[PDB]
Amino acid sequence: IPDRKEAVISLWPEFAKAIVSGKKTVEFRRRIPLPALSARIWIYATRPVKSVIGFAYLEAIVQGDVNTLWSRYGREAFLSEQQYRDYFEGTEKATAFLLRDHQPIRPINLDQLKEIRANFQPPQALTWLRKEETQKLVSLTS
Ligand SMILES: [Cl-]
Ligand SMILES: [Cl-]
Ligand SMILES: [Cl-]
């Protein structure tokens, strides 16, 4: 049973790159199941990259009102007010993940990930990694 110190998240490639390059230090999600505070977040870029391209660490978790969060962290989130607004339409509470110590790596493609976890689907929210899985992911890291 995973302890949520190791997790994977899915982003579109432009946002995934902004993160592994240290540009985007905030990720907004709805109220989803939470990682551990001290977690490594491995960053999975969707099509056409279809790879894990780095990781980053979680310096803080913020939940609160949608307007407040944009006002406070929206610039660090690298998306536009419109995108944020369309996404959080229909809810009043958001989650902000504050990120630090980003690390670009060379891409671990989707085939290698199904080699580590047989039925890997790219996470709609976060997926927690097993111990055995983390070791393999790390082994491929470069
Ligand atoms: Cl959701
Ligand atoms: Cl709500
Ligand atoms: Cl709620």
Residue numbers in the entry: 4 to 145
Paper text:
The bases of the bound ssRNA interact with the side-chain atoms of Arg32, Tyr90, Lys117, Gln124, and Ser128. Although these residues are not conserved in ZmASCH at the same site, potential polar residues (Asn122, Gln124, Gln127, and Ser128), which might possibly interact with RNA molecules, are found nearby (right). Based on these simulation results and extensive analysis of amino acid sequences of related proteins, we introduced a charge-reversal mutation at the site of Lys53 (K53E), within the positively charged surface cleft. This mutant exhibited reduced binding to ssDNA and ssRNA molecules. Another mutation at Ser128 (S128A) also decreased the binding of ZmASCH to nucleic acids, although to a lesser degree. Mutations of the two independent residues at the positions of 47 and 128 did not make a noticeable structural change.
In the ethanologenic bacterium Zymomonas mobilis ZM4, the gene ZMO0922 encodes a 148 amino acid polypeptide, which has been annotated as a putative ASCH domain-containing protein (ZmASCH) that belongs to family 23. Here, we report the three-dimensional crystal structure of ZmASCH which confirms the fold of a central β-barrel core and reveals a positively-charged cleft with a pocket on the surface. In vitro assays showed that ZmASCH bound nucleic acids and possessed cleavage activity specifically towards single-stranded RNAs. The weak nuclease activity of ZmASCH depended on magnesium ions and the protein appeared to prefer the consecutive pyrimidine-adenine dinucleotides for its cleavage activity.
